[PDB]
Amino acid sequence: MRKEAIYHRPADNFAYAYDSETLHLRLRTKKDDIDRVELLHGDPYDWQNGAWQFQMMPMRKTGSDELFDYWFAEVKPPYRRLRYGFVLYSGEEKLVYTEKGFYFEVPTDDTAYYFCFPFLHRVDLFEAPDWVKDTVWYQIFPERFANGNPSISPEGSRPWGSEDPTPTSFFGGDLQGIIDHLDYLVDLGITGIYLTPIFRSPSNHKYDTADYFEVDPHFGDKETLKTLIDRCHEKGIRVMLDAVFNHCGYEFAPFQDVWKNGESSKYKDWFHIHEFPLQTEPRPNYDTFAFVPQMPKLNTANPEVKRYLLDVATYWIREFDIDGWRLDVANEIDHEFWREFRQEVKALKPDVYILGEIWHDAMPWLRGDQFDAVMNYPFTDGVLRFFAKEEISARQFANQMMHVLHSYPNNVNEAAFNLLGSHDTSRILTVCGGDIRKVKLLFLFQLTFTGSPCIYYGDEIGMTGGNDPECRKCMVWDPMQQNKELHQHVKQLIALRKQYRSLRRGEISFLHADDEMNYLIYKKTDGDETVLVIINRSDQKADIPIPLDARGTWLVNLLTGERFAAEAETLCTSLPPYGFVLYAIEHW
């Protein structure tokens, strides 16, 4: 066995409380290097006859990435205290992996050798709002969804969908237009809406905020926003707004004061200023979002700033009853602020979903004291590389999915915001080079994956476009221009997801087929039901062997409803080019 590939450390994704009485422990080792692994565990103070009392529990291999095998075990400490280790077996070789290193047999003269999970506290438990787990989100960029009130449209607004958008063009989309098209979303099966910024700002995207306490006049007023939220609630749709707390806009009052009065302004500490007076040339002498002068970075360490943003955060919840806050550039704002943010938000309305925009590994923000989840862009990356660009094999895709999922605790993955694109990415149909068959596969995977998926407006009807701003075209309402095949496909999958719990909250496992290149086979299971998905990611028909025992095993096609029994101990599934099939499994 290779000791250099064995790893565990008491925190993050390797050791965490799943609930008030249960702990989850993981261990990773070199793939196929270990035959069996057992968790050695016991209460730190449980002694009898002068010997430490501990037991052995076999661990299950939950999956593996390109380099490692991941092992899992759940344990309910008798007194909520635990000292543990790992015993690995390979042939006649045995290793005991502990915090103090490796041993060849279990040392029991003391507990100091072992890893420790001191005490399971309910207060430190990671707990996201349960309702998001069954939710399917729909992201809307307000300036481009629907012009429901022409009288408030920006002057210079272009005819709807008359031309591709630019960084400064306006088409007159507003909040009323969203209200007017809610039945379209209900029919689709959407139960959650995520809106990009809607507070006063001069731009079409509004990430350069002028006033966080005012709805942009071009989008509507507070009365209209309230009606929108109330109407969504009546129809069973939760609403999440965009919080741009990392930076403000050039027209933000406090910034204007500092821009004019420099170091004597009482708002100078509200920002990250390097020298006075402020300037934008040759470059800004203050921190900004990226290198954008009109987006001054806010000092969230300043008491007055924190008070203001926390007031903003609770105001919209208290007065408008929103259901979530999507945090713009969340990773660039300090942890101290995010902890206070959670405390005040959750104290007001525990149901509010706290979603951070972080495109990379976000474990530091997912320990339970800050966010409920992050926009899962790493998932986006992997799914697009396999289904859209076909850059990696099915084997490599499974490895990447196993890699990212095992990088986090199970309860964290259960609340993950799994998207395929957004206002900050190219359109999936375009990433797919215009092949609807590939887009159908993207939706199939997304909608059968555990978590809280989000659909970018227009992707369900085949809208096209490159990256920002090309991906922000006016929503296509003309039924003659909407791709009917895709819309029906999405509606169908969302319905299925709502009907099968394993798709929404189950564990995922990948089965290795003969052709580990184009055939993807995976299962979703929650202990009560099991759904098998088989995908032929190739332009040729395929006969794919399904690795499952045929003893008393019955399958039910979820799309056609057809029931049939297996027998060949490995039934053969025949699929047309880019075809796919889903089966509910029955063991009688």
32 binds a copy of itself (CB under 8 A): no
Residue closer to Ca ion by CB (options 137, 219) is 219
> Which bin fits 197, alpha (ψ -120 to 50), beta or left (φ > 0)?
beta
Quote the CA–CA distance of 498 and 502 in Å, as a whole number.
10
Q: Sort strands 82-90 and 115-117 into parallel, antiparallel or unpaired.
A: antiparallel
Q: Give, in order, the Cα–Cα distances in Å from 568 to each of 29, 37, 259, 291, 588.
A: 35, 33, 76, 62, 16
Q: How far is the CB of 57 from a copy of itself (least distance, A)?
A: 21
Residue closer to Cl ion by CB (options 181, 231) is 231
Quote the CA–CA distance of 475 and 144 in Å, as a whole number.
6
Q: Which of 38, 242, 323, 357 is catalytic?
A: 357
Q: Which of 467, 478, 421, 483 is nearest to 164 (CA)?
A: 467
Q: Report yes or no: 455 and 137 within 8 Å, Cβ to Cβ.
A: yes
Residues 91-110 that bind a copy of itself (CB under 8 A): 99-101
Of 21, 32, 35, 66, the one binding a copy of itself (CB under 8 A) is 66
Residue closer to a copy of itself by CB (options 112, 572) is 112
129 interacts with, out of Cl ion, a copy of itself, Ca ion, none, CB within 5 to 8 A per kind = none
Token reading at 206: 């509004």
430 binds Ca ion (CB under 5 A): no
Q: Which of 143, 139, 146 is nearest to 156 (CA)?
A: 143
Token reading at 381: 């990356």
20 binds a copy of itself (CB under 8 A): no
266 binds a copy of itself (CB under 8 A): no
Q: Give, in order, the Cα–Cα distances in Å from 307 to each of 199, 221, 314, 333, 505.
A: 18, 24, 11, 15, 37
Q: Which of 65, 208, 242, 328 is catalytic?
A: 328
76 binds a copy of itself (CB under 8 A): no
Phi, psi of 539 (to 5 degrees): -85, 15
Helices (H), 321-373: 335-348
Greatest CA separation for the chain: 86
Q: Which of 511, 518, 560 is nearest to 542 (CA)?
A: 518
Quote the CA–CA distance of 486 and 503 in Å, as a whole number.
20
Supply the Cα-derived Rg of the chain in whole angstroms: 26
Site string for Cl ion, 223-252 (x = CB under 5 A): ----x---x---------------------
147 interacts with, out of a copy of itself, Cl ion, Ca ion, none, CB within 5 to 8 A per kind = Ca ion
304 is catalytic: no
| Residue 7: DSSP 8-state | B
Of 42, 44, 165, 172, the one binding Ca ion (CB under 5 A) is 172
Residues 133-152 that bind Ca ion (CB under 5 A): 147, 149
Token reading at 308: 């203001």
Q: Which residues contact 513 (CB under 8 A, 6 or more apart)?
A: 394, 519, 521, 544, 545, 547
Residue closer to a copy of itself by CB (options 290, 480) is 290
Q: Which of 454, 461, 210 is nearest to 355 (CA)?
A: 454
What residue type is assigned to position 245 of the chain?
F
Q: Report yes or no: 303 and 269 within 8 Å, Cβ to Cβ.
A: no
Q: How far is the CB of 150 from Ca ion (least distance, A)?
A: 5
328 is catalytic: yes
Residues that contact Ca ion, how many (by CB under 5 A): 5
Of 234, 282, 290, 568, the one binding a copy of itself (CB under 8 A) is 290
Quote the CA–CA distance of 14 and 30 in Å, as a whole number.
16
Q: How far is the CB of 124 from a copy of itself (least distance, A)?
A: 5
Give the number of other Cβ atoms within 10 Å of residue 495's Cβ. Answer: 13
Residue closer to Cl ion by CB (options 182, 392) is 182
359 interacts with, out of Ca ion, a copy of itself, Cl ion, none, CB within 5 to 8 A per kind = a copy of itself
Name the segment binding a copy of itself (CB under 8 A); options: 1-9, 159-167, 455-463, 553-561.
1-9
Q: How far is the CB of 176 from Ca ion (least distance, A)?
A: 7
Q: How far is the CB of 577 from Ca ion (least distance, A)?
A: 43
Cα-based torsion angle of the residue sequence 426, 430, 431, 433 in order, rounded to the nearest 10 degrees: -160
Of 233, 335, 512, 563, the one binding a copy of itself (CB under 8 A) is 335
Residue closer to Cl ion by CB (options 62, 224) is 224
Q: Report yes or no: 494 and 525 within 8 Å, Cβ to Cβ.
A: no
315 interacts with, out of Cl ion, Ca ion, a copy of itself, none, CB within 5 to 8 A per kind = none
Residues flagged as binding site for Ca(2+): 147, 149, 153, 172, 174
153 binds Ca ion (CB under 5 A): yes
Q: How far is the CB of 38 from Ca ion (least distance, A)?
A: 54
Q: Which of 77, 76, 75, 9 is nearest to 43 (CA)?
A: 77
**Helix, strand or coil, per DSSP, at residue 353:** strand
409 binds Ca ion (CB under 5 A): no
Site string for a copy of itself, 342-371 (x = CB under 8 A): ----------------xxxx-xx----x--
124 binds a copy of itself (CB under 8 A): yes
Residues flagged as binding site for substrate: 247, 326, 423-424, 468, 472
Q: Which of 377, 389, 376, 392 is nearest to 520 (CA)?
A: 392
Q: How far is the CB of 496 from a copy of itself (least distance, A)?
A: 31
Token reading at 187: 């029919």
Name the segment binding a copy of itself (CB under 8 A); options: 328-336, 434-442, 443-451, 508-516.
328-336
What residues make contact with Cl ion under the rule CB under 5 A?
227, 231
What residues make contact with Ca ion under the rule CB under 5 A?
147, 149, 153, 172, 174
Indicate which residues carry an active-site annotation. Answer: 328, 357
What residues make contact with a copy of itself under the rule CB under 8 A?
2-5, 7, 9-11, 30, 44-45, 48-49, 66-68, 79-81, 99-101, 111-112, 114-116, 118-119, 121-124, 287, 290-291, 301, 331-337, 339, 358-361, 363-364, 369, 377-378, 381, 403
